[PDB]
């Protein structure tokens, strides 16, 4: 009720500002978004209104990307908005989820540019471009891999801000092997990529939760897994998985306040890592 009024007010402010700034393509997209938002308000279509909020965010990205000289990011934000508007009348139920992921990775690109992580910012644009290409053309399976890429890109951004530079470098490398494999089509490689991302999630969370020893073991697991991703073995996925299962137990035992079991899982995880390195 009052919230959709807020969203319509915001997008109308964007169009006025875009007109004043000479951003005619952005301004007209905002106007059509405002027109679409009012139609969905009279029809009570909640799902269309949810897409409206996401579209307004990516239009904010486009206006801000232009103000920062990030013209390529601005063009991708506009393409995202155009594709999102067309799909509202098309009737794709997955439109909200697809556009949501694209907007999140576009946010990473803009934020990484402000934080000096140009390498990460460049990678986020490529992920968005492939996601936009997949949606504009009709590629379905790619979007599943896009989700995992955006997750590991989030890890790299947070690790850099948290001072975990070793984790940030690994996350940057992991996404590239995913982006390279996405455009190459190697599906067996992507399975190992998924497990590595879980490993990187553990390392990020363990560092924040006073589990530095656990985090270091997770880094060893991921760094050993990348050397085998470039080796090309399916037994690697099983080997990493057996490490992941017990790395998770130590993390979950700490959350539940069971330090005795946390040490037991930690030592078994270390033993499994040592055998692979041996």
């Amino acid at each position: 009720e009052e919230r959709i009024k807020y969203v319509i007010t915001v997008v109308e402010q964007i169009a006025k500002d875009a007109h004043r700034n000479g951003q005619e393509e952005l301004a007209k997209l905002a106007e059509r978004t405002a027109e679409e938002a009012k139609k969905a308000t009279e029809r009570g279509e909640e799902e269309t209104l949810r897409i409206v909020y996401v579209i307004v965010v990516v239009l904010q990205i486009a206006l801000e990307a232009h103000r920062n000289g990030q013209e390529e990011l601005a063009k991708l934000a506009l393409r995202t908005a155009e594709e999102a508007i067309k799909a509202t009348e098309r009737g794709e139920e997955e439109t909200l989820r697809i556009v949501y992921v694209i907007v999140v990775v576009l946010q990473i690109a803009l934020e990484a540019h402000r934080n000096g992580q140009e390498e990460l910012a460049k990678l986020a644009l490529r992920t968005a471009e492939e996601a936009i290409k997949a949606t504009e053309r009709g590629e379905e399976e790619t979007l599943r891999i896009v989700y995992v890429i955006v997750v590991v890109l989030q890890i790299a951004l947070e690790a850099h801000r948290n001072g975990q530079e070793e984790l940030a470098k690994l996350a940057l490398r992991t996404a590239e092997e995913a982006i390279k494999a996405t455009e190459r089509g190697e599906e067996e490689t992507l399975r190992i990529v998924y497990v590595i991302v879980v490993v990187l999630q553990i390392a990020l969370e363990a560092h924040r939760n006073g589990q530095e020893e656990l985090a270091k073991l997770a880094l060893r697991t991921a760094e050993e897994a990348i050397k085998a991703t470039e080796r090309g073995e399916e037994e690697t996925e099983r080997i990493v998985y057996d490490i992941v299962v017990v790395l998770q137990e130590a993390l979950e035992a700490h959350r539940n306040g069971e330090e005795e079991r946390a040490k037991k899982a930690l030592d078994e995880a270390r033993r499994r890592i040592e055998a692979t390195e041996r």
Binding site: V54, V104, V151, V195, Q201
Partner: peptide, 19 residues
């Protein structure tokens, strides 16, 4: 009276489920 502040950025994606 002044323009409303912009919409906050979308929250990040939830982490991958555990194996």
């Amino acid at each position: 009276l002044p323009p409303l502040p912009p919409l906050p950025p979308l929250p990040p994606l939830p982490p991958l489920p555990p194996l």
